[PDB]
Design a protein around this ligand. Structure first.
Ligand SMILES: Cc1cc2c(cc1-c1cc3cc(C(=O)O)c(=O)oc3cc1O)C(C)(C)CCC2(C)C
Ligand SMILES: Cc1cc2c(cc1-c1cc3cc(C(=O)O)c(=O)oc3cc1O)C(C)(C)CCC2(C)C
Lengths: 214, 9, 215, 10
C-alpha cells in the first residue's frame, strides 16, 4: 500500500559573491536531507541497499531540483535555496548560467506556481522519480516499477478527490517530468564542467555524486 | 558511494 | 476538438557499406522528410504560425522519430528495424561503439512498448504530445500549444479508458515513457554532434540542418 | 532551417 499521507509527512519532515558556489553549497547540504527524505518514503528502506544506492545516485538531481523549485513558487524571478538565500535571475545571468536558470524558472517554478502544485503532489512526483525502474543495475526492476505504479495510482486518486474540477491535473503533473529530466541532465553537465575547470568549490557529497559508478 | 552508504544506515 | 482517429491516420499515412551507424544516420535523414508530412496531418498543427511549426519540429524531431522506429521494432528481438527495411541487431551496435545508447532504446522504449503492447493510436498521441511541446523556446504563443497538448492528452486518456478499461494505470504508464524518451533523444543528439565533429560518418542534408544552431 | 521551411510550404 502507498498512502499519500505518508509521502506528505516525508516532505514536511525534511523542510528547512559567486552565486554558483552558494548554489553548490546548498546542493551538497540537501543531499544529506535527501537521504532522510527517501527513508521515510514507504518501502524504500526495504529494498536491497545496493538498489537504494542506485535509485538515489540516478535520481538525486531531479529529486532535489524538484524540491527547491517548489519552494521557490512565491519568489519572483528567482529561487530560494535551503540555506535561506534567495538567488535572483539577474545574478545567475551575471555569473554565466542564465540560460539554465531561466529554464528552471519557466519550465518548473512558474508551472508549479500557475497550477498551485501542492506538497502532497510534489512528494508524489518525487516518489515517482525515486522509484525509477529504468535505473541501471537494479537487482529487481519489476519491484521498483511496482512501487512506482502504487505511487502514481495514489496520486491520481488524490487529485480526483481533492481537485475534482480539474480532470487534467494528474496528467499535467506527470508531464512536468520530461522537463525535470532534461533540466537535471543539463545541470549535471554544468557541474562536471565546474569540477573540470576546478574554479568553484564542490563539497564532499556533491563531489561523490559526481563520481563514476562503483 | 562511501558517504551515501553510511547515511543509508 | 482533437480526435484520436485523425492522429492514427497520421501514423498510418506515413509508414514505409557497413558502418551500422551510417545506415542509422541515412534512415534518420530520410524520415525527417516523412516527419514533416506526419506533423501536417496532426490536427491544428498546420494552423499554427510557420515559425512555431519550425520551433516545435526542431525541438522535437529526435524524440518524435526515436518514438516511431522504437515502436516499429517491438517484434524485433534485441534490435531495431530502420525505415529502410534494414534490421540492426544490438551486437552490431556494440561492435560499432554505440552499444550503451542502443541498449537504452531497447530496454527503456522498445521492450516497454512490447510488454504493454502500445497500440498505434497510443503511439501517435504520445508523439502528438511531444510535438505540442509548450516549453519549446521562442514560441509566439505557448498557451495555444499547451492547449493543443491538453486536448491530445484528454483524448488519449479517454481512448485508453474505453479500449483498455481493465487497465486503469495504462494512461499514466504511457506518459511515463516520456522522460526516458527525452533523455534518450538528448543522448543520441550528443552522439550525432560528435559524429559531425570527428567527420568520419556521413550525415545527409536534412539531418545536418537539424544539427545547426538556431536563428 | 531552409529545407524544413520548404517542406512546411504545403
Ligand atoms: C548545484 C546546482 C547548480 C546549478 C543550479 C542548481 C543547482 C542545485 C541546487 C540545489 C539547491 C538545493 C536547495 O537549496 O534546496 C537542493 O536541494 O538541491 C540542489 C540541486 C542542484 O543541482 C541551477 C540550475 C539553479 C543553475 C545552474 C547551476 C549553477 C549549474
Ligand atoms: C541517427 C541516430 C543515431 C543513433 C541511434 C538512432 C538514430 C536515429 C535513427 C532513426 C531511424 C529512423 C527510422 O529508421 O525509422 C527514424 O525515423 O528516426 C531516427 C532518428 C534517430 O536519431 C541509436 C540511438 C539507435 C543508436 C546510437 C546512434 C548511432 C547515435
Amino acid at each position: 500500500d502507498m498512502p499519500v499521507e505518508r509521502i506528505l509527512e516525508a516532505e514536511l519532515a525534511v523542510e528547512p559573491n559567486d552565486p554558483v558556489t552558494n548554489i553548490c553549497q546548498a546542493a551538497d547540504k540537501q543531499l544529506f536531507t535527501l537521504v532522510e527524505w527517501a527513508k521515510r518514503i514507504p518501502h524504500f528502506s526495504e529494498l536491497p541497499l545496493d538498489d537504494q544506492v542506485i535509485l538515489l545516485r540516478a535520481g538525486w538531481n531531479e529529486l532535489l531540483i524538484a524540491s527547491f523549485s517548489h519552494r521557490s513558487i512565491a519568489v519572483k524571478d528567482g529561487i530560494l535555496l535551503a540555506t535561506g538565500l534567495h538567488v535572483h535571475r539577474n545574478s545567475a545571468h551575471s555569473a554565466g548560467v542564465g540560460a539554465i536558470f531561466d529554464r528552471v524558472l519557466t519550465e518548473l517554478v512558474s508551472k508549479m506556481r500557475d497550477m498551485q502544485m501542492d506538497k502532497t503532489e510534489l512528494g508524489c512526483l518525487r516518489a515517482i522519480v525515486l522509484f525509477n525502474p529504468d535505473s541501471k543495475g537494479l537487482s529487481n526492476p519489476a519491484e521498483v516499477e511496482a512501487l512506482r505504479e502504487k505511487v502514481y495510482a495514489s496520486l491520481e486518486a488524490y487529485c480526483k478527490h481533492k481537485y475534482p474540477e480539474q480532470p487534467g491535473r494528474f496528467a499535467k503533473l506527470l508531464l512536468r517530468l520530461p522537463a525535470l529530466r532534461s533540466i537535471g541532465l543539463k545541470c549535471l553537465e554544468h557541474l562536471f564542467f565546474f569540477k573540470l575547470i576546478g574554479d568553484t568549490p564542490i563539497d564532499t557529497f556533491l563531489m561523490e555524486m559526481l563520481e563514476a559508478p562503483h | 558511494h562511501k558517504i551515501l552508504h553510511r547515511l543509508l544506515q
